[PDB]
Design a protein around this ligand. Sequence first.
Ligand SMILES: Nc1ncnc2c1ncn2[C@@H]1O[C@H](CCl)[C@@H](O)[C@H]1O
Ligand SMILES: Nc1ncnc2c1ncn2[C@@H]1O[C@H](CCl)[C@@H](O)[C@H]1O
Ligand SMILES: Nc1ncnc2c1ncn2[C@@H]1O[C@H](CCl)[C@@H](O)[C@H]1O
Ligand SMILES: Nc1ncnc2c1ncn2[C@@H]1O[C@H](CCl)[C@@H](O)[C@H]1O
Ligand SMILES: Nc1ncnc2c1ncn2[C@@H]1O[C@H](CCl)[C@@H](O)[C@H]1O
Ligand SMILES: Nc1ncnc2c1ncn2[C@@H]1O[C@H](CCl)[C@@H](O)[C@H]1O
Ligand SMILES: [Cl-]
Ligand SMILES: [Cl-]
Ligand SMILES: [Cl-]
Ligand SMILES: [Cl-]
Ligand SMILES: [Cl-]
Ligand SMILES: [Cl-]
Ligand SMILES: [Cl-]
Ligand SMILES: [Cl-]
Ligand SMILES: [Cl-]
Ligand SMILES: [Cl-]
Ligand SMILES: [Cl-]
Ligand SMILES: [Cl-]
Ligand SMILES: [Cl-]
Ligand SMILES: [Cl-]
Lengths: 291, 291, 291, 291, 291, 291
Amino acid sequence: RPIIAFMSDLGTTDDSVAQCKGLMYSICPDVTVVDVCHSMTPWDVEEGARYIVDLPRFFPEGTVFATTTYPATGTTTRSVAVRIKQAAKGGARGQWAGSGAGFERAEGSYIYIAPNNGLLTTVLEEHGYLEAYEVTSPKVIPEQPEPTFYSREMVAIPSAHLAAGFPLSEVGRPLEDHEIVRFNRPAVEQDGEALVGVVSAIDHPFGNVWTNIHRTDLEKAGIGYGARLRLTLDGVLPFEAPLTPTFADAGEIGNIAIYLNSRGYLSIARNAASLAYPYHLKEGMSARVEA
Amino acid sequence: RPIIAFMSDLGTTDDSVAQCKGLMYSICPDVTVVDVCHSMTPWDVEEGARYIVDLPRFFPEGTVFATTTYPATGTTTRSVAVRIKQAAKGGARGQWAGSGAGFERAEGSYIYIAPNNGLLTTVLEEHGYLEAYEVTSPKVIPEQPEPTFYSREMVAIPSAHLAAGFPLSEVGRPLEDHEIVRFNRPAVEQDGEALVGVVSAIDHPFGNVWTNIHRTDLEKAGIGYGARLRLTLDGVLPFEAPLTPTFADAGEIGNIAIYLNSRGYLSIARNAASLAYPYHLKEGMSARVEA
Amino acid sequence: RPIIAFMSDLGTTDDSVAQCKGLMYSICPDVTVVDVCHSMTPWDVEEGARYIVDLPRFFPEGTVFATTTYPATGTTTRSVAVRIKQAAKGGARGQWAGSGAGFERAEGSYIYIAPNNGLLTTVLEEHGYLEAYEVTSPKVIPEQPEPTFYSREMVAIPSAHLAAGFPLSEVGRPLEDHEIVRFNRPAVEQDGEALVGVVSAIDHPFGNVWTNIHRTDLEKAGIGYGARLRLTLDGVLPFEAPLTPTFADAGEIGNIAIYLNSRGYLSIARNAASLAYPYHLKEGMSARVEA
Amino acid sequence: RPIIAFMSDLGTTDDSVAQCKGLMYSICPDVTVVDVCHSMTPWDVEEGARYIVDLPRFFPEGTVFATTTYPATGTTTRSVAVRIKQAAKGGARGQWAGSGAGFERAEGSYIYIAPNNGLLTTVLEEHGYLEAYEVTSPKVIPEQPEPTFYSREMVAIPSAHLAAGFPLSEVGRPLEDHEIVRFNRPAVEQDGEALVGVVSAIDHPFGNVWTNIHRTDLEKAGIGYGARLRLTLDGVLPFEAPLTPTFADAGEIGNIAIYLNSRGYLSIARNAASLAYPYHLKEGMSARVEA
Amino acid sequence: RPIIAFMSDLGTTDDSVAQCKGLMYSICPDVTVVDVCHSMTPWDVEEGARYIVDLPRFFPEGTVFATTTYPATGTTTRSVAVRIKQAAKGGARGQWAGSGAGFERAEGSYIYIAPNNGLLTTVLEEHGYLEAYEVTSPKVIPEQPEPTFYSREMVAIPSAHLAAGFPLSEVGRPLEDHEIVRFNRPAVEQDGEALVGVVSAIDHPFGNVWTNIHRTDLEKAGIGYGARLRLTLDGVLPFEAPLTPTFADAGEIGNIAIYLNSRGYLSIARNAASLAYPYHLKEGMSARVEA
Amino acid sequence: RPIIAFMSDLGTTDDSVAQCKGLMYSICPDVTVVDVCHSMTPWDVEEGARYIVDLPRFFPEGTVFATTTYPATGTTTRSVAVRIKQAAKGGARGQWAGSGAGFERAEGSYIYIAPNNGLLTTVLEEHGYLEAYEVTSPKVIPEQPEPTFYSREMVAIPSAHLAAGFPLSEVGRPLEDHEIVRFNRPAVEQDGEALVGVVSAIDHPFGNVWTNIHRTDLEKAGIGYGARLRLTLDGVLPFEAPLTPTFADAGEIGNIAIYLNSRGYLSIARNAASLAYPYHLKEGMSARVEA
Ligand SMILES: Nc1ncnc2c1ncn2[C@@H]1O[C@H](CCl)[C@@H](O)[C@H]1O
Ligand SMILES: Nc1ncnc2c1ncn2[C@@H]1O[C@H](CCl)[C@@H](O)[C@H]1O
Ligand SMILES: Nc1ncnc2c1ncn2[C@@H]1O[C@H](CCl)[C@@H](O)[C@H]1O
Ligand SMILES: Nc1ncnc2c1ncn2[C@@H]1O[C@H](CCl)[C@@H](O)[C@H]1O
Ligand SMILES: Nc1ncnc2c1ncn2[C@@H]1O[C@H](CCl)[C@@H](O)[C@H]1O
Ligand SMILES: Nc1ncnc2c1ncn2[C@@H]1O[C@H](CCl)[C@@H](O)[C@H]1O
Ligand SMILES: [Cl-]
Ligand SMILES: [Cl-]
Ligand SMILES: [Cl-]
Ligand SMILES: [Cl-]
Ligand SMILES: [Cl-]
Ligand SMILES: [Cl-]
Ligand SMILES: [Cl-]
Ligand SMILES: [Cl-]
Ligand SMILES: [Cl-]
Ligand SMILES: [Cl-]
Ligand SMILES: [Cl-]
Ligand SMILES: [Cl-]
Ligand SMILES: [Cl-]
Ligand SMILES: [Cl-]
């Protein structure tokens, strides 16, 4: 019962994803293809990374994650396929996902295949990895790949072979760590007692505001549920509220909530109202907090 | 072959739906997850109810409907899981869906699991129910559920157990009828002999206009499939046309069609052209009809 | 392990697609339903045609393509079901799809079902057909079809019967070629030394510009990779670049690339930036190429 | 105390109008320059014509109207200067303007100067003319005119000489009527019992809708105040109201009024609310009236 | 050297204002017509009032202010003409306007003429008045006024007669105070130590934010230049800064400035950047301050 | 007959300009105020400079130019008032404006008064100056100027005294050249034989595109009035056409015209159609030209 979870920048407005899927079912007849999402900003490797980093612990062991934005499509570049180490514990407090005490995942149970353009930076950072290979074998990719469609040729197709049981180590040569491209992760800074980060994402479709300031960054500063915080955005739009577990703790609908989101990051919203949209708040805006 | 049909307000721009599906496949290996939609206006329980109310007759018996907008996420609230009675009939008459005379559905063949926030209001009304339960057992939800993600913790996860055959009656204690939250549905009022309701929906992607004025309000009002009607929208925009069963009945492409949609409601459209978009017609605009 | 690949104009904002899928699983329990896309401009049969013409080579043999925009829903019209001949080769070079040398697909191995409104024009033109039938039998359509929902009644339902192995030739009577509605598709005009055509699509979500000028058109003007081209859009934008296999060949990010897209068509783009969006280029603008 | 009333397409965002005015004061020191408007759609001679045709009765005799959109700037074309005949009566009733019984204006008492491009079509049609001359003498235009600024060179400058009392007939040679370019203005079609025309303008900033159906058209169909009308816009909006003198007659704020505008034309509006803006009604949509 | 300062909702996109002006020059040949503005939101008497209330002290004594939005155009209503008492001292601290110690204006030196719909509410409140008359005489208004153009018929025209020296008391009968329509002025409230008002206006074209909280309201609370204030808008977007005389006191470009505007009202801006526009701040938003 | 020509960033939506004009008429009873424009992007000293630099030759001698964007309003800064030397010549050659051979202007015939913030940079460059003074005397500015309104206090008021004949040399102390702030103007650079500048302006309302590439840069570059040029905008959008003196030279309506505007700068337009608006071309986009 193999699964491929598929994240691309292909969109859902034409037959691009369906072409990849027909091939995935062709190669791995028993496969289930789960869409992650296909709407990411094209070529934004950092955004793509956020949609894939936390997936492992939610999926059955043995799942393959086919994850791709491929701006270098048609170049001599080749995908990397990696077996991760730990399916972390996560959340706004960390754990295995699921009912009861959650579903514990054995180590080395998930493979990602992606362009080697840094898309997997946070996956490897958070999960570690046991082995990594360049994807080059004509057994798992086209002999004559379509130049403009490497997301199909060098990700979807080889991902189906992996799901179909093709030995990972057979895809191509091992990659040394330095050969795996990484993006730079801007660190959360300290300015006096405040923490300076950025708005990492607008949380669609709610218009919640996510920062890159993490629960661990907060607890490093003696900040926990119930602390009166001031959070400034874009350096000028400021906000004040206690840190609360969830939206409704803000009281009335529309009231500001400052909370930790399901990924453990300091976030800000309105209670059952959109914060970001009325004010055109955006990813990339400076975000500063302080108790 | 167990099915979960999944309707949420989570959107399709991030990994939120994938986290839920991952856990569904973890819990019910042989499951098939069918997306209903994930684009509903967040926290609009009335809109979400429209997308789920007439699902059962289209699905195989035993299908589990996981349906959720959860603005009370992270509070002491718990989901409700119900077995509905009649699978029923829809369109502008009431009947069974499918080829030939349609496929009859045995009573009690479908389970809905949703936040107890009135989302199931119209489902219970149209279908009735045989049993309803609070969803509390750590066999079917997390012992430590993520505060801001009850759509996953309190709907997606438990739905997967139900699809897998976990006894409904064991999810938690039984709920009395009064304990199941309902939303209020505004009635069609009378002014002279005109009926006065609202635009219940813009029917995307076509730009058709759906009213809350039902067949029954028309019938035993005098209006039948050939009546010249005057339909005024937003208190300003008047349209005139015979009541017809379909769009092409309007004749020329672009001509006004006033018809009954499949849910039996008075609707208005242009024939193979968009009515709503050019005039910027919107949900909630008043709608008035007279013969 | 039957597959229905499903392309409609139903959108993804309500339960319309889900109703169709529920019925597909009801009729063909072992079915896999693969979404192609549901976001096409309603009633734009030429656009719908673009999303379906290239599908066959990507899917396992026996796949049924349920493809539909149905502005004549509720009339006496009936759908057409056709068995295609060639699952063609049609990409930038013209090859079978998949790893190695590709998956060669047998002839006569795919069925399309669609309104008989010309939606299948390019499918038949490119692939040919072995047999075609009007879809009328109450064994595969409803005796009392919902007037406004022929995409479900006259496509989704019968596609599931076909996928379950209901004999093609039993859906209804044979259609003569002339009874199969086609739309006209203008040729590329071999103007003097130039090839004259149109922008056929904006390639979402990248903003790439696709023309209807196919590689075969380029051949016979003797135009291949390396050729210094002038591609003039909208009559006033004389873009100049060599024809290259892919985006990165243009060098700097944002630089213009002229290339052959994965459908085999002459296209223009910027390297890892959007061409169409910033300058609001649109489908239907003139496209002229020359070396 | 000479007056130039100045209507151009120059906008109010740069120094173009000021350059013209500086020159007007340089040439005719005692002049008063009255702005008509400068915001017309560039090169839309029919719109420009609407803003100037009704001016004469409002201004003191001897007023010079410098009116210009000049897309043929920098060519061999030269402007036309005309002395009109009747300063007409033309409002909802047809009267002289001002307190008491109005200011009766003598005949032959206003001069227009404009590009000879049809801008003056309705001026001549409504008022008649006594004499017309091509504007060529170096006494009133530059010997070396700025190619891209004929509105200044060939209108503003010569208008100031005219206002300073430079003899009309000395600007250049007499033009034969046929040498005076006119645009065609379609009539209201006396369709059966109805009068068929167009939306001629959206009345900014109120969003009122003006049609080209003049009170004289209404007369002779026997339509006057009190008449219950059906005014159908855009072919599909059958507005119904009595023809009333003014907006408030419609009763409640937002109620539809059908009236005669201050130019004498059949118009439709909402009482102290906007009709055109919310529903995006536009100039050029069909307009049909009938009682 | 009479002056009429003219404020209307007529806009500047057609010949409406020019019609009024031609008549003003016709009636009062020596007049200068100064535009105040013509862009006000139609029928917003409160906004119109803000554009006229502070004008007197800037203008030569004897100036007539013709000020009009006329939603009741064509009804039996008639304008009011009033001679004000004091040309106040104003500003963010109050005074006569001009060089040196300013230009002191004698009492009873200005007349406003306007519809009697409350437009003059704040004029009379701030300036007092010496006498008021209904404008009804056929010596100063048309015998047959155009129904839809009372801003011309009942304001522009009579204003020119006043400028021309027609005795004010001759316009019509005296009006008692209760016959002069007033709008309700929402008071600035106190909530603990805070002051609650509203955003009274977005200050175009800068995007500065003006409140209805006045310098006197502030100094009633012991708040003066240099006080650290918290100002919340829309109940959620908060801001912190000392009260400073001007924008540049904020330091760096873009920094928040809280200041008193030239009309003496508590305002908020960014230093040489727009505050309102990036965040879509709007008039009507709650505004609260507190030291 | 004294004239003030008035250019500001105050807009035309409130009473700001009227307050200034009121004081101008108070101080200089016989003055004529001519609006240049009031719509400039606030605080953009480069844009404001474009609207005032070529004014003098169009105006009668003795005209006072009051020109202001004042983001340093309320600081210790004071305005500068200068008498310019040559009135000069403009267009694409340099000459006098007006009928016949134009009207020559004696040297030293114009005074500008502006904030000392570089607004006059191009004025001084193009015209030279005979004398410059800091504006400080309480004879010409307020003793207590409103902090947020230096455009009125430090420009409008003093300009009116100057127009009235207040001796320039008495407004304050003389300024040395180095004390007059200038802005830096980016030069046209060379790449190969292409000239590389910027779009200096979108020429509203026509949508013409103005570059900072001047006649002189072209001349003594090889480019003359018949040269086939390639003009690339924003580094992407290419246009081709001969250099022509005007729009109609392009031939067909809509055709590309590359020309010199009146200020002598390389510009590009469509003939009697808008270039900028459909392609969303903007100020500041790079512009590159090659023969
Ligand atoms: N700002 C907000 N206020 C209240 N509820 C919110 C919210 N943002 C997301 N949710 C709710 O959280 C649930 C699980 Cl993610 C989603 O279904 C969504 O309805
Ligand atoms: N206003 C309209 N005119 C003509 N056809 C329409 C329509 N709205 C929906 N459909 C057509 O109804 C089918 C079943 Cl929902 C869809 O495929 C859509 O094409
Ligand atoms: N204009 C462009 N420049 C660079 N890369 C591009 C591109 N358009 C699509 N792709 C890349 O092509 C891959 C297969 Cl469609 C997609 O994943 C997308 O990332
Ligand atoms: N792109 C263009 N094509 C044709 N005519 C144009 C133009 N831009 C400005 N004008 C014309 O130039 C005259 C002097 Cl500025 C204005 O009245 C305007 O009509
Ligand atoms: N649709 C409408 N309803 C009510 N009043 C209206 C209106 N359109 C214009 N006016 C009013 O008519 C006056 C003369 Cl044009 C203007 O001042 C304007 O206020
Ligand atoms: N937020 C702001 N920051 C800096 N200066 C500003 C401003 N708003 C208006 N002004 C400046 O104030 C002058 C007098 Cl009203 C105007 O010309 C305008 O340039
Ligand atoms: Cl969250
Ligand atoms: Cl935006
Ligand atoms: Cl598990
Ligand atoms: Cl319902
Ligand atoms: Cl809880
Ligand atoms: Cl492409
Ligand atoms: Cl667009
Ligand atoms: Cl009107
Ligand atoms: Cl629009
Ligand atoms: Cl201010
Ligand atoms: Cl907005
Ligand atoms: Cl004075
Ligand atoms: Cl310059
Ligand atoms: Cl100071």
